């Protein structure tokens, strides 16, 4: 119980934080996006995505567009990487962007 409860807690805590983007930097040719995200113990772990596969997909439920974080001026923008079905969550505040 101790071993598996600790494993589940750590793994799902990491999974919750795995959507958010700590940092996102283009490549020189702007064909790749290097995304730094949260590691299990709180520090950085780096991934790479192709900008061609990144899309800001509209919700499947058309009535749920009102109930989005991106409606707010300081909400969150979820960009789906479609070649791996992963999520990049950005803060839509101008101070975090270049």
């Amino acid at each position: 119980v101790a071993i598996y409860a600790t494993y589940i807690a750590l793994s799902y805590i990491n999974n919750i934080w795995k959507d958010y983007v700590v940092r996102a930097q283009f490549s020189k040719d702007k064909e790749l996006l290097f995304v730094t995200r949260v590691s299990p113990f709180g520090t950085t772990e780096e991934e790479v995505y192709e900008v061609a596969h990144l899309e800001h997909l509209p919700p499947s439920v058309r009535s749920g567009v009102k109930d989005l974080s991106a409606q707010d001026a300081d909400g969150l923008v979820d960009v789906t990487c479609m070649s791996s079905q992963r999520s990049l969550v950005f803060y839509k505040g101008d101070q975090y962007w270049n």
């Binding site: 700590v22 996102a24 930097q25 490549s27 020189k28 975090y96 962007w97 270049n98």
Partner: peptide, 16 residues
């Protein structure tokens, strides 16, 4: 593919 660094797009470090 070329993996050389480019322009930084987004940065929210405090999340860490």
């Amino acid at each position: 593919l070329n993996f050389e660094e480019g322009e930084v797009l987004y940065e929210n470090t405090r999340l860490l």
